[PDB]
Amino acid sequence: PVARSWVCRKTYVTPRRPFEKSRLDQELKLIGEYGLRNKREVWRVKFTLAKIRKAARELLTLDEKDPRRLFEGNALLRRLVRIGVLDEGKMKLDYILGLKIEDFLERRLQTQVFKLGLAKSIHHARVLIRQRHIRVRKQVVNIPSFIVRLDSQKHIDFSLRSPYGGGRPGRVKRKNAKKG
């Protein structure tokens, strides 16, 4: 006996067919649109969406006045509204099945840094996040797969310690300015 926890999951599933041209083209189009590292990020978002839809489809089998269905349905709806994937008007359990992978990929920190004009490219956005130039509210966030909440989007800043933020220019400018 040890005081250790062994709970862990896999966050993706490998597809059934290895070489299908339509799936390869669609996944590469997603990677190019959102500047992702490999197919595993696409598969991870796809697996998250599949879990959400399985939960909703399990909820829709119950009676409309069931207590579990109401409680879990409003929980799932509020969770999907808070990340900005659902809207307030279309906050119903039937609309959850109409969700896309591209809906969830817009909510990444990479996409939101690119959209707000902090970066000039989606690849530049991934670099800038990985380089510790981006902060959210006050915490420096180094993860590009950071899902931005709807109340957390309005203030994404340049992390004052960064050269693009407050000050202290980096290694290259200090070396080049110390030439003469």
């Binding site: 902060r135 006050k138 915490q139 420096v140």
Partner: protein
């Protein structure tokens, strides 16, 4: 100068004659500050001498802002000596640990288990 000390959940534990609290240290430019500076700032904060304040468990958050630790101010040094663990007293020089390892005294215990009577104190 820019180092700021703030206190979360505070309690006067009269059962152990102390005041226990959670400390946040804000140091936006520097590294994680040493314990002596934190002890001095709690000493000026709570009007008590820094020789009785014991602080520990300081974790610096990612990014480089806050540091969160735990702190205790005792009423006197006698209560501090009676109620602190010996290792937090040894960080202030109030304790001295024996220099013998485990294995030496385990083997010594077995060796004197092999012998009987006042001859037990001779072996070593």
């Amino acid at each position: 100068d820019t180092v700021t000390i703030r206190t979360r959940k505070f309690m006067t534990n009269r059962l152990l004659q102390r005041k226990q609290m959670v400390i946040d240290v804000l140091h936006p430019g520097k590294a994680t500050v040493p314990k002596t500076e934190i002890r001095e700032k709690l000493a000026k904060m709570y009007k008590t001498t820094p020789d009785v304040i014991f602080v520990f468990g300081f974790r610096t958050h990612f990014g480089g802002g806050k540091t969160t630790g735990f702190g205790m101010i005792y009423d006197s040094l006698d209560y501090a000596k009676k109620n602190e663990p010996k290792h937090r007293l040894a960080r202030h020089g109030l304790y001295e640990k024996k220099k013998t390892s485990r294995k030496q005294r385990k083997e010594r215990k077995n060796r004197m288990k092999k012998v009987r009577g006042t001859a037990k104190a001779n072996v070593g």
